[PDB]
Amino acid sequence: VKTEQEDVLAKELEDVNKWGLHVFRIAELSGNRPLTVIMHTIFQERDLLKTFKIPVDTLITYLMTLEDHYHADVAYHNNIHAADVVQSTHVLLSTPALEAVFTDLEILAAIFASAIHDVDHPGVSNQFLINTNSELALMYNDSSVLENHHLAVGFKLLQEENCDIFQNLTKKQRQSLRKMVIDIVLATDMSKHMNLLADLKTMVETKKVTSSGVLLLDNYSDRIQVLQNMVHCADLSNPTKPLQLYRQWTDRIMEEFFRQGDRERERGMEISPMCDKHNASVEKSQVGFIDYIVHPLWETWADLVHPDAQDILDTLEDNREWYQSTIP
Amino acid sequence: DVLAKELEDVNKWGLHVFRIAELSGNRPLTVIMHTIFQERDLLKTFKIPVDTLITYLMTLEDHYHADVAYHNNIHAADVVQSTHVLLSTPALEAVFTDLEILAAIFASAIHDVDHPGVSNQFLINTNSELALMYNDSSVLENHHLAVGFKLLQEENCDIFQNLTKKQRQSLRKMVIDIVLATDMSKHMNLLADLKTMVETKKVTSSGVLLLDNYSDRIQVLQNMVHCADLSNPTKPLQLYRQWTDRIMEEFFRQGDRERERGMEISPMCDKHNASVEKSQVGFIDYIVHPLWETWADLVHPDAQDILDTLEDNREWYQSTIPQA
Numbered sequence: 284v285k286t287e288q289e290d291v292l293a294k295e296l297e298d299v300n301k302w303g304l305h306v307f308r309i310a311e312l313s314g315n316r317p318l319t320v321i322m323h324t325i326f327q328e329r330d331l332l333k334t335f336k337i338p339v340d341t342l343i344t345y346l347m348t349l350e351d352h353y354h355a356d357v358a359y360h361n362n363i364h365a366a367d368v369v370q371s372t373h374v375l376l377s378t379p380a381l382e383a384v385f386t387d388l389e390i391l392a393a394i395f396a397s398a399i400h401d402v403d404h405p406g407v408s409n410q411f412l413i414n415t416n417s418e419l420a421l422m423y424n425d426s427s428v429l430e431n432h433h434l435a436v437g438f439k440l441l442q443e444e445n446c447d448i449f450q451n452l453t454k455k456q457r458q459s460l461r462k463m464v465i466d467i468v469l470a471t472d473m474s475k476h477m478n479l480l481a482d483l484k485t486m487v488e489t490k491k492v493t494s495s496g497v498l499l500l501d502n503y504s505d506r507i508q509v510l511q512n513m514v515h516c517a518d519l520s521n522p523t524k525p526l527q528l529y530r531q532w533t534d535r536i537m538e539e540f541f542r543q544g545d546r547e548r549e550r551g552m553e554i555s556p557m558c559d560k561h562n563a564s565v566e567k568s569q570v571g572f573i574d575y576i577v578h579p580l581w582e583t584w585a586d587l588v589h590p591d592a593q594d595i596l597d598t599l600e601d602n603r604e605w606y607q608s609t610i611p
Numbered sequence: 612d613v614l615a616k617e618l619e620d621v622n623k624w625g626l627h628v629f630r631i632a633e634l635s636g637n638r639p640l641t642v643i644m645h646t647i648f649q650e651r652d653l654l655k656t657f658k659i660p661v662d663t664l665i666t667y668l669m670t671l672e673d674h675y676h677a678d679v680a681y682h683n684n685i686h687a688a689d690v691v692q693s694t695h696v697l698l699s700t701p702a703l704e705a706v707f708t709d710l711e712i713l714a715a716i717f718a719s720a721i722h723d724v725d726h727p728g729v730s731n732q733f734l735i736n737t738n739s740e741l742a743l744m745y746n747d748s749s750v751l752e753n754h755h756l757a758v759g760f761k762l763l764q765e766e767n768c769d770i771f772q773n774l775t776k777k778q779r780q781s782l783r784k785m786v787i788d789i790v791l792a793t794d795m796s797k798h799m800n801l802l803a804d805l806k807t808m809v810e811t812k813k814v815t816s817s818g819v820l821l822l823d824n825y826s827d828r829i830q831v832l833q834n835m836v837h838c839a840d841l842s843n844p845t846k847p848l849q850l851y852r853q854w855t856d857r858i859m860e861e862f863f864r865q866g867d868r869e870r871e872r873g874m875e876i877s878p879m880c881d882k883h884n885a886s887v888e889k890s891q892v893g894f895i896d897y898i899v900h901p902l903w904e905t906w907a908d909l910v911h912p913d914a915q916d917i918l919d920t921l922e923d924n925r926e927w928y929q930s931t932i933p934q935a
């Protein structure tokens with residue numbers, strides 16, 4: 284355990300290797316430190332401290348700082364979402380079809396990218412930031428504004444006192460991990476979804492597997508592509524989770540969206556799609572989200588790692604039925 | 612006075628820009644931008660208060676670094692003026708809207724603002740704050756854009772104040788697209804696509820190019836400003852020599868910092884082991900000529916005088932290099 288608690292957190296953390304970890308429970312039991320606790324657990328499980336000579340106190344110090352820079356008053360894009368994506372990536376990394384495909388450095392990059400990928404999220408969209416002429420959009424030229432910011436912050440925090448968890452990587456290692464983490468977080472920009480999926484389908488069509496069905500990736504292009512899509516899937520994994528988890532994620536994203544719509548309405552701006560609390564169809568919207576975004580993505584991932592992801596797909600379909608059933 | 616006579620050549624390749632800098636009190640960017648805006652009737656068209664223009668331009672010019680030998684206000688003024696000339700090439704007559712013309716010229720003016728005199732790779736390799744900010748991706752070019760637009764916020768500096776919301780939005784997208792294309796790491800991809808565009812190009816009866824969508828139009832503007840940025844070797848020898856002096860001074864200062872830091876010194880940045888002639892001939896052969904012969908193809912025969920000068924300058928510099 285990497286944070287002061289008491290306790291029974293251990294019984295819940297037994298599911299850290301399973302889809303459907305109750306991450307909200309973890310948040311409660313850990314004093315709202317789900318990202319620190321789950322990251323610390325994963326790093327120990329994967330022996331990453333020993334491999335990369337990461338001092339444990341340095342890891343905890345960085346995680347505490349990183350966690351503090353997720354906004355507590357943001358309903359969805361907060362430290363629990365970061366913890367969720369981290370843990371979800373951790374599960375996907377261990378899928379049998381990917382056995383021994385990735386290096387420990389690649390595993391570290393995926394997990395680190397997952398942890399920082401929404402840090403300092405303000406609870407409003409890229410388009411909102413652009414439309415309101417935010418300093419952030421001015422900084423990043425309207426291009427992957429948030430995602431560029433999340434990386435800048437995640438890396439800059441390494442420079443805080445006793446926070447450089449990469450201090451004992453080689454120069455080449457840090458350079459490679461940096462490139463991979465950047466490639467991965469920039470791929471979480473939803474504006475890149477259709478292209479990313481399109482390329483993922485292409486890769487699937489011409490995939491190569493050993494006898495036991497293990498994927499053969501040849502080069503960096505292959506490997507980074509699978510990692511990009513993996514963390515993208517993890518980011519978009521809410522509707523594939525056990526329904527009670529999914530239901531809370533839906534509650535939180537709508538709360539966050541509605542708060543942006545309130546900011547838009549207050550400034551006399553056109554209210555963004557699905558951000559109008561006065562005219563929302565939350566259930567119908569989740570069904571469309573699954574039909575046009577989440578299922579097409581996950582159907583393709585499932586193909587890539589066939590048959591590893593079948594139950595994830597089945598759960599997605601069951602959860603689609605639930606929101607369908609509850610349209611008024 | 613004398614300045615006025617020099618600015619008469621503003622519509623011509625090979626404007627004595629260094630003379631203009633001396634004569635204006637080191638305000639080439641302000642003088643040349645003002646002149647071009649007046650010539651193209653840009654103040655009237657976009658209702659730009661002339662006082663606002665000068666205030667912006669003076670502040671913009673102030674944010675080019677004095678102590679940087681190549682990437683300064685004179686380079687900026689040169690690229691602006693060169694783009695201004697290319698815009699009027701016969702093959703592009705009446706093709707671009709006034710907004711697109713404004714975007715191309717504004718982009719040129721800001722395209723290197725607050726340049727520190729060291730390369731992207733240097734900034735990446737030294738773990739600079741700029742590289743941390745921009746995730747190692749077009750580090751300087753993103754920065755130029757951010758600063759160029761940020762200055763519009765200064766008091767009485769918003770030259771786009773009377774653009775419609777939509778015009779401002781379009782201008783902003785176009786300028787970003789253009790300045791990002793000045794990143795040399797994108798050169799080969801730009802050039803490969805330009806060659807493919809040339810292959811399938813369409814012209815009117817009078818012979819002007821037909822660019823019927825934003826993609827084709829911005830592509831031409833991107834490559835035009837990139838050519839302007841890479842136009843030094845196409846200029847009269849007296850001007851080209853001066854640009855070569857300055858880029859080498861700048862590079863060698865980077866090399867100096869690399870050596871002090873114990874770093875491996877970048878190509879062409881080692882003052883002790885560098886050859887001007889050899890370096891310019893390679894620069895022409897492998898970057899500038901491939902690009903300009905493609906531009907010349909696009910607008911043939913509009914740019915043949917430019918291409919001729921470049922090929923003469925190449926022949927000139929290779930002539931003192933011993934060869935079999």
Ligand SMILES: COc1ccc(/C=N/OCC(=O)N2C[C@@H](C)O[C@@H](C)C2)cc1OC1CCCC1
Nearest residue numbers: 408473521532533536540555556557568569572
């Ligand atoms: C549990 O559900 C979700 C989980 C995660 C996400 C993340 N989505 O990424 C997009 C985004 O962030 N935008 C998109 C833009 C149109 O609107 C901008 C305010 C921001 C969305 C979820 O629900 C959808 C479906 C209906 C409500 C949203």
Ligand SMILES: COc1ccc(/C=N/OCC(=O)N2C[C@@H](C)O[C@@H](C)C2)cc1OC1CCCC1
Nearest residue numbers: 730795843854855858859877878879890891894
């Ligand atoms: C008058 O000459 C020039 C004018 C302009 C330029 C602009 N070059 O753009 C690229 C660049 O800045 N760098 C930085 C450094 C790492 O090296 C490059 C591979 C990439 C170059 C000129 O001459 C060459 C030949 C020798 C000096 C350079």
Ligand SMILES: [Mg+2]
Nearest residue numbers: 294295297298
């Ligand atoms: Mg259990």
Ligand SMILES: [Mg+2]
Nearest residue numbers: 400401429471
């Ligand atoms: Mg995000």
Ligand SMILES: [Mg+2]
Nearest residue numbers: 722723751793
């Ligand atoms: Mg530049």
Ligand SMILES: [Zn+2]
Nearest residue numbers: 368400401518
């Ligand atoms: Zn996310």
Ligand SMILES: [Zn+2]
Nearest residue numbers: 686722723840
């Ligand atoms: Zn330049």
